[PDB]
Request: fold
Amino acid sequence: MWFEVLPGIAVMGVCLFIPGMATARIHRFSNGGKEKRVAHYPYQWYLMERDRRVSGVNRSYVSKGLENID
Amino acid sequence: SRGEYVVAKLDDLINWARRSSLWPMTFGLACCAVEMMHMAAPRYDMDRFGVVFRASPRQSDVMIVAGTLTNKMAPALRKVYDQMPEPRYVVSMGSCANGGGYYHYSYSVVRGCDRIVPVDIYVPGCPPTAEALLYGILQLQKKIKREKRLRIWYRR
Amino acid sequence: MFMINILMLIIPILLAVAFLTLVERKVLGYMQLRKGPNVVGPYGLLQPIADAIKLFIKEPLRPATSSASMFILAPIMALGLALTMWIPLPMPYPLINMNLGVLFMLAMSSLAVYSILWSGWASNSKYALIGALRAVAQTISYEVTLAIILLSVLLMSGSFTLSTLITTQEQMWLILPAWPLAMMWFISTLAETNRAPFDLTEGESELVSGFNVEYAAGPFALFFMAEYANIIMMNIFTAILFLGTSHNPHMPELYTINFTIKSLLLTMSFLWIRASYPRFRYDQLMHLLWKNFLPLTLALCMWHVSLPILTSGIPPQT
Amino acid sequence: EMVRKCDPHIGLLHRGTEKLIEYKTYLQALPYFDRLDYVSMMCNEQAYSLAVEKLLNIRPPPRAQWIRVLFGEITRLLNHIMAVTTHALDIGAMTPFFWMFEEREKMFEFYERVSGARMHAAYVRPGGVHQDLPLGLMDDIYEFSKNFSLRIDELEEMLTNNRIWRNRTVDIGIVTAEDALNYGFSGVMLRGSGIQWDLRKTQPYDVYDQVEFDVPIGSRGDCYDRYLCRVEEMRQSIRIISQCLNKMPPGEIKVDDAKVSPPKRAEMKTSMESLIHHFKLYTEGYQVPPGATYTAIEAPKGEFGVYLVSDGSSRPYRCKIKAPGFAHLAGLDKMSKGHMLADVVAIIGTQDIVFGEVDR
Amino acid sequence: VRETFPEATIIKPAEIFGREDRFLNYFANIRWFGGVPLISLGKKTVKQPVYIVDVTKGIINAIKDPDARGKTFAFVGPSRYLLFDLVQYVFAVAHRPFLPYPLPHFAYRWIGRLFEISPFEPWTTRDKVERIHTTDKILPHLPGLEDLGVEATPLELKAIEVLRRHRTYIEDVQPAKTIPTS
Amino acid sequence: TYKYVNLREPSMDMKSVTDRAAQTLLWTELIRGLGMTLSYLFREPATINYPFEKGPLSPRFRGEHALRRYPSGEERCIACKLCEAVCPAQAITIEAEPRADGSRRTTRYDIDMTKCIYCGFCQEACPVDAIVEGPNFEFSTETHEELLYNKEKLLNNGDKWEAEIAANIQADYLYR
Amino acid sequence: MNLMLALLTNFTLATLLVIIAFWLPQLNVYSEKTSPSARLPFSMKFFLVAITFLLFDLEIALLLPLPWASQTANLNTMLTMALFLIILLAVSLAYEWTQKGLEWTE
Amino acid sequence: MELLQVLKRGLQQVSGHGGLRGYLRVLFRANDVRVGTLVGEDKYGNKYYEDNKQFFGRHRWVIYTTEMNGKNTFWDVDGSMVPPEWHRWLHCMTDDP
Ligand SMILES: CCCCCCCCCCCCCCCCCC(=O)OC[C@H](COP(=O)(O)OCCN)OC(=O)CCCCCCCCCCCCCCCCC
Ligand SMILES: CCCCCCCCCCCCCCCCCC(=O)OC[C@H](COP(=O)(O)OCCN)OC(=O)CCCCCCCCCCCCCCCCC
Ligand SMILES: CCCCCCCCCCCCO[C@@H]1O[C@H](CO)[C@@H](O[C@H]2O[C@H](CO)[C@@H](O)[C@H](O)[C@H]2O)[C@H](O)[C@H]1O
Ligand code: SF4
Ligand code: SF4
Ligand code: SF4
Reply:
């Protein structure tokens, strides 16, 4: 019956699902649980470089808030 | 962890792949080709065994000779056989291909395709039923399953 | 970490291609009132594995190639480019976030025609080369509409960034404002990938289509994998382009599930179409492109340049 | 792209059938006719049987004649499914082949239930048919025929209005009426060009003048009109089969003259005369009075005929087989002029060529 | 064998050439590597190869010949050649570029050893090189092909048959120089 | 009587011209063809599960040959050679002589199954139902020589298949 | 760096698959077989489809900046020149069409 | 509710073959998990089933013995294993087993 085609489709579906799921999870693993920063234009890259300096640990995804104000 | 064991299991793997993925080149010469087409048709669906219906001679693993082989045609059949990549097998389908059949005594007919190519399975009938041909294909699968290429290599 | 990401893209791609071969045979089987592979593994789930092993231990074909370097380069180019087409795709996040990702995909696909040309050159056969040239002429012809159609849709998106297509379709699928472009886009992808009813490389009108003809070729498996990776990729691109999935930043997996289903369904429609129609003649598919799609695509490009301006709906640049 | 010359080289299935027949008795030669147009087996048998019955100056009984028309039209369905769907399969439309070959598989069962063979039945013989229909067969033929026109409609849904199919067939291989006649075409190769000819109507045999059907006629003489004619001929065959089922008479199924048709096995084992006639018919065979006939029928592929020469003995002196596909293929060069390579595949399909009959 | 089965027919052929030979095909496949080594320079080695069909006919004629029982035959070709000329001719028929270069046995034994490591038919081995560079014995006390009614086939008449497949894609050919007959 | 298959002139009013334009541009008749293949996808396939399931046959089926006996075990064949005379393929070779007890019996009965066309003429001609074509069709072999049946092979087939052969004869002999 | 690594990985794997696709069959050690510029003639039509593709493809290069061009203040000028380019692309097709540059009959 | 009745039948087939181990045995030997009425068993261990609701051609089937004449036929089955008495029934040459 036609539903015996589904097992092969399910295998295809899992294979196509993995790259998208992996990229999202690896991005959050590598950027402190947040989305990887998007820098398409120099202004965005300029702020990312500034964050890397401001962090004090050389990672742009380490955010400093009002605790650094004084 | 003997070499006999590993060679034995590797034989089973390659034998399994080769028999589970048999791509035929059907040489539809005459009436028997019709029954071959009924083996691909829905009732028997040869494709469900892993036997693709229409495969090019460049990727084929088995040649099915389905019909009378005439003298004028014998050179072209041998040429296709010589161009088949290995491992290659030949199934002779029907009385004409098996031994000449109804036309055995003709001036223009090759008396069995096994004068031209080596034949692995002979399927009798005029024509063999689609089911008879399928039986013969499944017989070839079991013959491939019995192959011992790596065991023989290991004992050379 | 990035090296893991690459392998978590490449390996699943090769597995999807493997099992698409099984899905095609079973879907085509049931539309033909039969089953397709159901003996090698339960529901034929081992059939792709048996075919793969069988092909790689098969003897290489004869005759010898005319050019060894081009004989080896063609399959490398086909498969290398096929995998490269996947790296900017947002699912919902891309492996490589390009500002000009759409243009990158156009550029890389236009290079896929070289494997056809090189394999024809290395075939050592006059007739096989002529077959390759007809295939190239088909491919480049339909590249014209894909580029112009793509440009027309981006006038509603506002940039060449693939992930911006997601934002553009946050309210509504682009297929509604652009269904005429979607129709011609979808057919162009069929003709671009040499799929039925445009599969003349596998047809009956070629000088080399004769069964008893021979020329240097192969490996068959590598070319086959490259082709089917492009079928899936084009249908993934089609979904993103016209059937944009909503993205929730806190639940990216929901995007991926919904996005995967749409891509699968579009891919199944390629199989659906292959089961339904006869094959075009070479001159007739040229006529379809040059005398039907192209005049209408140029007109719709004019319309989609004008429409955002006259409705005050120009999209943002960033 | 253009074809300038088409030179078919045949003989690759020439098996010297005509020379072999001269060494067989008339019964022994009957199975050779199954293996000519091996898609229209029982129609080939009927043609040979009519020719022999004519030289013998005997006629088969009415029930045999209705059985021969019934299975003649079942055979036309077998042939047209093959002709149409392999024509479609060879230009890429593969799916109708599978749907309709399941229908062919069920008509193979009718062949097997009357003869014990799916294809080469050897069932129609000079004098009638070999055996009477098994009980329950006509009911199953009725059940098959009841649903078959729906199967034809599904085929038409795939092809008839399809623009791709029409592009591959319309105005391809146009044949004028005058050329069709002089090139020796027959069957649909004639009716596609508007010629109003059909041997069942004009020179009827068996009981074809007792059944009602219409001859489909084309208007453009191209591949598409010949495709429409074949599809419509399948509908007419169903219409004829419907009348054969209702009008099937009772009685014996082979001529009641034991110097031509063998006696019943029960008679052969009790009567001295029957045993002698059984012995002689299966060894020497019946003698055929000297003479020559050209006998033709409207086979599914066109006019199929035999020029049969008897020298007065039990073996034919000469048997020339007129295969309709022989003249049709001879016209391939004429028809392919001004067309492309892809069109030659369509033209060969529209001619409905089986090399069993072309090469003999 | 002569002690066990005294009436045995022993046939002692020279290197045999033919479609499936490992002689002409051996030299043709040396081209598959740029180097074309040769003990000395292919000199000091004289070869008298015999055609495969000639050996076959000789064997068959031996089965049918009552005289042949208990004898020892030597099957050799008609013409003796220098190993350098033969290989040069082989490359000329195969339309290949011929690049000779000298080597002694010690440097020719390591290449032989290096390919002996293969778990299949080696491309070459020390023993194969030693046999190739063994001069073909002249044994005039033994009967040959002519005693069995077989005419030895010249190599020049059959080289194309064997080496046509090795060509890359006027037939000057240049017949190889033959050592003066005894 | 005859009918035209293609002699309709299309109407040329707006309603009709625009219907044809919609078909051209909106691919409607192409979509219809997709509907038919989709409908088949949801139909049960016609495939049987060979070799666990078998295609139907009838008692008349012409398969592998066999030589039969009387209930006592005596051979039915009395070497009349009607089968050898009628065989269209000359597939039968027979020799005979008086048996030790004086009975008329064959010493050779060969069928070249690669000459045979499986026509069933031999079993029609046989006056004592000695030679028959049984129901077996699954006897393909790996060598050509295995298909050259001698009398021993054919008698073994009779003893092997008689249970089924007798029932099939019982079912069809009144049609003969 | 990442894009270079991705391209290197993709074409490295493609290369390995190709060489093992060419070496793995040599494990079988199959038997030896021992049994096997100028015009084409090339049709002018196949050359002219390639050239037409190129010239149309060059005009597409000029149209690619349209998404950015629509951000300008001089929209009237931009729209006039955008439609001008597409129209000349149509005029090229019309000229080819009406001189039978798109035919395949000889 | 029809979709749930289909799922019930699917799980009812698992019980019909004697549990998961029996269900997988038939699935891998015969690529078919239908449950039918047992019609009989021959002396070699072949089991014959019928289901008259199936369409003609699938209404009768045999599950081959796993060992016949000393041959292990767990995986290697063959249509020639059906003895003549059942051959007539399995090929529908007759109605009665
Ligand atoms: C308010 C005003 C706004 C302004 C914009 C208004 C625009 C709307 C009005 C225009 C409508 C445009 C329609 C777009 C489709 C293109 C139409 C077309 O070109 O099709 C015709 C083409 C040729 O047709 P033919 O009959 O052979 O010959 C005619 C020429 N002599 O024939 C074909 O192309 C047929 C297709 C060939 C391929 C067949 C195989 C595929 C069929 C299945 C596809 C299923 C649907 C796919 C949908 C995918 C969506 C993702
Ligand atoms: C692998 C299979 C996956 C599927 C899984 C199961 C779900 C099935 C969903 C598929 C739906 C399509 C299948 C049904 C199609 C059959 C229906 C049909 O036959 O309609 C025919 C109809 C009449 O045609 P005709 O007779 O020629 O009339 C002409 C003048 N009235 O003709 C028509 O009216 C056609 C009307 C539509 C024309 C639209 C033209 C194309 C426009 C493209 C837009 C695509 C949008 C959808 C894409 C997917 C995104 C959701
Ligand atoms: C990890 C994955 C490794 C890669 C595994 C690749 C497995 C490939 C399995 C292919 C299964 C068979 O799939 C089927 O193959 C044949 C080719 O013979 C194709 O056949 C098609 O191409 C050939 C020419 O190439 C034509 O002669 C044929 O008429 C056409 O239909 C079918 O379109 C395809 O459906
Ligand atoms: S064996 Fe019989 S059916 Fe087959 S080709 Fe010969 S005559 Fe025709
Ligand atoms: S079936 Fe026909 S061909 Fe075969 S042995 Fe009997 S009579 Fe001869
Ligand atoms: S099998 Fe019958 S016909 Fe043949 S010789 Fe014996 S008794 Fe006579």
